[PDB]
Amino acid sequence: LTPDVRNGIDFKIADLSLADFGRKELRIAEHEMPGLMSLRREYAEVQPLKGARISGSLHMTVQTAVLIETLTALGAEVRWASCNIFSTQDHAAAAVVVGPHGTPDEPKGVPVFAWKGETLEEYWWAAEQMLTWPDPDKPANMILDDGGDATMLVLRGMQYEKAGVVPPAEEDDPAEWKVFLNLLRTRFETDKDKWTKIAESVKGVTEETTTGVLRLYQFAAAGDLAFPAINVNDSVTKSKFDNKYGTRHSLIDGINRGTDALIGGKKVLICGYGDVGKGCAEAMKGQGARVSVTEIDPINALQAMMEGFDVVTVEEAIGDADIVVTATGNKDIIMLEHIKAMKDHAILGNIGHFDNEIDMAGLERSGATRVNVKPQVDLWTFGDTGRSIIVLSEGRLLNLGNATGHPSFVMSNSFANQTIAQIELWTKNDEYDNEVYRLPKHLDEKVARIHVEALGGHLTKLTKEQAEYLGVDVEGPYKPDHYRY
Amino acid sequence: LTPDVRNGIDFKIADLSLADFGRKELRIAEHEMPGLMSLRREYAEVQPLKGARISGSLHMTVQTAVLIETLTALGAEVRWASCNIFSTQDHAAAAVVVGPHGTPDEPKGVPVFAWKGETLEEYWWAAEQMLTWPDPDKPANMILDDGGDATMLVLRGMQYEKAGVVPPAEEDDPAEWKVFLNLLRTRFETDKDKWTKIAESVKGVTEETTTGVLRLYQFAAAGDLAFPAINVNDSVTKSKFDNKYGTRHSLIDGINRGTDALIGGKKVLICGYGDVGKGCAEAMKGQGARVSVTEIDPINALQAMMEGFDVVTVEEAIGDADIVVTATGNKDIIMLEHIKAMKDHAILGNIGHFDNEIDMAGLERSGATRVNVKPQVDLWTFGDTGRSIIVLSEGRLLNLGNATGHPSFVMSNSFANQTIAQIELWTKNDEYDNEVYRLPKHLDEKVARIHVEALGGHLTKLTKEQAEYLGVDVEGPYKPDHYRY
Amino acid sequence: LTPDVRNGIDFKIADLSLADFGRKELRIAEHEMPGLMSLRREYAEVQPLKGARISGSLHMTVQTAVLIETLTALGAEVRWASCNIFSTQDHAAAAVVVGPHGTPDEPKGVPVFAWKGETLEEYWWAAEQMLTWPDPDKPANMILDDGGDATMLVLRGMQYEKAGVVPPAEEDDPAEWKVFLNLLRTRFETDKDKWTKIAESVKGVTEETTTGVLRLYQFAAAGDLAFPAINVNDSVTKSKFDNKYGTRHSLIDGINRGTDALIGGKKVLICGYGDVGKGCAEAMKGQGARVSVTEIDPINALQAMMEGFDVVTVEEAIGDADIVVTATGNKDIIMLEHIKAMKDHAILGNIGHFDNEIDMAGLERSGATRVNVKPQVDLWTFGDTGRSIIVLSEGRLLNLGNATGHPSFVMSNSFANQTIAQIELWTKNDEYDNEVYRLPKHLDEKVARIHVEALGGHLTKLTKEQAEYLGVDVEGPYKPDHYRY
Amino acid sequence: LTPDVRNGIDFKIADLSLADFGRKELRIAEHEMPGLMSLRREYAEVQPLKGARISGSLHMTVQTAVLIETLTALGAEVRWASCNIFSTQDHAAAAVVVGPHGTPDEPKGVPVFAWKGETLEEYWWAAEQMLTWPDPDKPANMILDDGGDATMLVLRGMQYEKAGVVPPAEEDDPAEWKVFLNLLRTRFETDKDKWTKIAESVKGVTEETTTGVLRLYQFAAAGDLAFPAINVNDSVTKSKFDNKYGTRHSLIDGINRGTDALIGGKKVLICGYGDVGKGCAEAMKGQGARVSVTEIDPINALQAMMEGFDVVTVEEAIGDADIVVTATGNKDIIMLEHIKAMKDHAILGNIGHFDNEIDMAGLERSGATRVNVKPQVDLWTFGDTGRSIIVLSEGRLLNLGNATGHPSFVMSNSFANQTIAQIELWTKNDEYDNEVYRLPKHLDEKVARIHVEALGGHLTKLTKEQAEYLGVDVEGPYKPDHYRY
Ligand SMILES: NC(=O)c1ccc[n+]([C@@H]2O[C@H](COP(=O)([O-])OP(=O)(O)OC[C@H]3O[C@@H](n4cnc5c(N)ncnc54)[C@H](O)[C@@H]3O)[C@@H](O)[C@H]2O)c1
Ligand SMILES: NC(=O)c1ccc[n+]([C@@H]2O[C@H](COP(=O)([O-])OP(=O)(O)OC[C@H]3O[C@@H](n4cnc5c(N)ncnc54)[C@H](O)[C@@H]3O)[C@@H](O)[C@H]2O)c1
Ligand SMILES: Nc1ncnc2c1ncn2[C@@H]1CC(CO)C(=O)[C@H]1O
Question: Which residue lies with its CA nearest to atom 6 of ligand 2?
Answer without folding.
Answer: D243
